[PDB]
Amino acid sequence: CDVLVSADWAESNLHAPKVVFVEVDEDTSAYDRDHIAGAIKLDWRTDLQDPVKRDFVDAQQFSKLLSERGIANEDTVILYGGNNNWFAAYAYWYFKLYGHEKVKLLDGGRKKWELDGRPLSSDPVSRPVTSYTASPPDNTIRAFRDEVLAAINVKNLIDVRSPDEFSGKILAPAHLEQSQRPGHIPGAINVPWSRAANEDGTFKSDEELAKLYADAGLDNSKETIAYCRIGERSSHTWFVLRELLGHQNVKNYDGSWTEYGSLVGAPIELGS
Template sequence: MAEYAHPEVLVNVQWVADNLQNPKVRLIEADEDVLLYDIGHIPGAVKLDWNVDVQNPLSRDFIDKEGFEKLLSKWGITNDTTIVLYGDKNNWYATYAFWLFKLYGHKDLRILNGGRAAWEAAGQPYTKDVPTYQETNYQAQPANEGIRAFRDQIFERLGDPGLALVDVRSPQEYSGELLHMVNYPQEGAQRAGHIPGAKNIPWATGAREDGTFKSADELRKLYEEKGITPDKDVITYCRIGERAAYSWFILTQLLGYQNVRNYDGSWTEWGSLVRSPIER
């Protein structure tokens, strides 16, 4: 993994197994299928339910700084804790959590390369025991919105050659053939298509069949062939920002791009805006 720009953000199964009793390490499972944790999880891991734990209950936004501090304090996490995130489906939601935790400034974040699938393939055990930890007094940083994009920032730069938009959804969603992903009608939009000028690089093309990340050379080629180069301001989007966070992780952590933001409003917002420009 030394080929990546920041190889330290990835750990393997053996590293996790060796650190299960390490009090300075906290495992967090973040799944698309929130029932998986209850079926079995890595010993010592806590559950992040994306629909409950990190959502503002009133506005479409994340929990604020104080809410984030309360959540991590409940899990016994300090500012010096090494947090290892993992989950199902190629770490889809684990990388979303990585992005959110970066938003609030946690320093030592890792991803278990391959997620749950890698742990299972190695024959490592699961448990149903839910751990409890002594509460801490976690102190978050003010939200770093330099890694987050908003609709007006995109409107202002449509057609700007220095801006590279990456639509990480499926080709069918990008083309407008599908209005929303199958089984996710609640995350649909009024119109189908994509933001003008956006390039389609589906998020899952960054993973190997076993769910681990492709090599740096493979990933670099994947993006540069579509004109997504390090000299540009890059914005990733999908439908609610979760798949886009996976691509944001690849670009910033594995390839070392300096100017990448995740537009978490994504297509559920853009596709429902009055007079928003759309291509098909």
């Protein structure tokens, strides 16, 4: 597509003119041993987040980051990674946020790739520094708490966590604590991100996708906001709704539940 590429296409374009392959994951230890030939790495925690404030980097920082890494405005960017391509989808969203036009996701991420047995490289990579200039933030695709609060009833609210997180039965996936209140935003619909993807990690057809979200009760006549626990899994769904099925107004609530379930006085709904 114009926003998605297949492993085959990727394989056959490893070293094509103005095309940069970038690996995104929250750890980056996977890249420091095996990665697509020519690929560079962005560490989600250490490169894309603020060191002090609960926030991701701003325009000026984003520009210095990409410059230092050799990404140019006119490059076509291919994103891919582990953890079900979650953070690749998070990066995809950061990119669109700062106005990058030619950005494409790699269907399946680092997991379809490894499964097809495609060649990986362990050779260090460094590109000549560029002169990248980000656009001021496009908040048409970002939701902040207040507008998240102001929604409720007004908008499709899509909770992409697991059912047990959604119902409030559990606070977080499997590892530990996150807010201090369990549950979801009143009115919210539970489509665990996972349903939008095949066993191998690739996105499902627009036919399967429309069905999935129709069945769950997504109101096509309403504007939509997606949320997760840390925006993690929500930017993956955002990409699905806006980029694949092409809804016009879809925001990612990056704050997600870690913020929401910690706000005092905010409405909450238990159960399913």
